[PDB]
Amino acid sequence: VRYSLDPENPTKSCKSRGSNLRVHFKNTRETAQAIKGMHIRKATKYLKDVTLKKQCVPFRRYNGGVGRCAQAKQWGWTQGRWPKKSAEFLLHMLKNAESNAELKGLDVDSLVIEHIQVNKAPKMRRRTYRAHGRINPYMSSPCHIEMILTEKE
Amino acid sequence: SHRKFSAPRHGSLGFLPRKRSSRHRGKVKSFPKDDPSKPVHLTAFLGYKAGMTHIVREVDRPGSKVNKKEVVEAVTIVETPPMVVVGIVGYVETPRGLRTFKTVFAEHISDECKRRFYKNWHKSKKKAFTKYCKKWQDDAGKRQLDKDFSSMKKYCQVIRVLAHTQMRLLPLRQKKAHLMEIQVNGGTVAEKLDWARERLEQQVPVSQVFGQDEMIDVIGVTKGKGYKGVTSRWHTKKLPRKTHRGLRKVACIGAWHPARVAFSVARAGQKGYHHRTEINKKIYKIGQGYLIKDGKLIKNNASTDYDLSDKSINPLGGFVHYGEVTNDFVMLKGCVVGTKKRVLTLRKSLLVQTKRRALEKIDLKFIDTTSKFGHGRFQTVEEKKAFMGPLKKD
Amino acid sequence: SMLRLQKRLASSVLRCGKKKVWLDPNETNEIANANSRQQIRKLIKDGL
């Protein structure tokens, strides 16, 4: 289907996407920036380090209230967190991403992740009860993911 | 409107950047202006704060009511083992300031001092001052050195010396040595230089530097106490019980139409770990440490002229949070800034101290060695053994 | 797997609280296939 950015050489690349994912939008954007240029083998390790609070993610745009941590200094920033949930999802997405490449006939250990992009999705809603008989909304913020691999040694 | 009942203000505005110091060791901000009358001598020294104890002495001050009486007086122990000279550095005087002209290190530098120039020692290869020490094993290197010294003969006015501590001997955990600059206040620059050139790479004890019944200025960092509210920091009045939203506060800050809040008003923050300067601390006694003679070592430091008993200043069960005091020390009157194991920078007085009190002569009668770890009731162990007797375990 | 039903019946048979019933943890799969009161009376006589 029509992706936003067309790859330069289809022979080299493979596509993959994922729709309507119950995750926080704001977490997934910044974690998605740090990985953007990296190697696939570095990242699948890297994300596992996040699960153990070993390597942080620097929070740049969506930075309101976020506490400081020491590991961010590698990136050149103070604020960082170890957002587990967002890691576990787009690790399923790489495996699904890699297998699909195998059908097209490529070497896995040359694949550089060239592009990634998040979009907001249709909000769900439940409610919470408050004082003096008032009922505010209590809304989810789910997100659309998509990504494009390119071979680069 | 006017305040009804006038009252003096809490605190001082002249200290009020109440902030955590970048530095941990106290900088000697300004040394004295040297004078030829005296021969050359060193202005400053580096000690460590061990603990506290009692003293007893007959005092002689005609005119006072306490004339011919045996008072007691509290004293600190500052362990000041000898420091090692490893360098000089010149300082030209300008209308802008006092620019550093040319530093000259020695050939051989110890590993305690080398430790300072690296963050991670285990990792590093320890390659410091290798290519430099070549200048001390060639004709050309010493030749440029001679040019350096001749320049410093001409143009440089002031000379400071780089003297590091011998931390290896101490019981502490850190092995990393403290370097430090020490200004020389003496005669002419040539003399001052040939003396330091003579003493380069040499030991320096304290008996050389300081003497007894001298007033000195103690510098050091305060014992930090963390976050404390404005009450404990600035010492305001507590509010009464009926308050809704708390009472350990200052209620009105400032007025309306000076629409800002002034800097003088007391707020909350960090207390302590402020750099500080106590003055007029009299040196009652420089006690000599442990040293071996005739096979056996002689360690009876606290034996005085009147008691003539063998005990040392080391109390029962060691000084708390320190170790065994083997090296030389000083016994200052009163408290001083800083906690245990804390470095304490001693300095000679800027002002010419000449009063009836400052010229007073000390004659100690007794040094208390009883335990600090609870209500001690025994000076020494043999006295204990006599009072108690033989135990079951023996 | 899921044995709250069997504990409940055991209590109704013995006419006591299920607080007192002791089951053998080892023969779990053997208990799970009970689903019936006479078959439990059989397990009682059996002694598990």
Binding site: - | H54, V56, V72, K365, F366, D368, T370, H375, R377, G389 | -
Partner: protein, 63 residues
């Protein structure tokens, strides 16, 4: 420095510590610590208490 003795315990008091108590009748007493002080005010007879000297003295211990 008259190293005064403790009235209660029988220990030798050294100069800086301890706390003297001068009553209205006279009879200046010395005490090493509040432990002795509290027993003194509650009027417990020291000859019964083990750690004191008078106990081991009464029962002829040592020598």
């Amino acid at each position: 420095m008259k190293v005064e003795l403790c009235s209660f315990s029988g220990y030798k008091i050294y100069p800086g510590h301890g706390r003297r108590y001068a009553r209205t009748d006279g009879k200046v007493f010395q005490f090493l610590n509040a432990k002795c002080e509290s027993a003194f005010l509650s009027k417990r007879n020291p000859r019964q208490i083990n750690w004191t000297v008078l106990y081991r003295r009464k029962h002829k211990k040592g020598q």
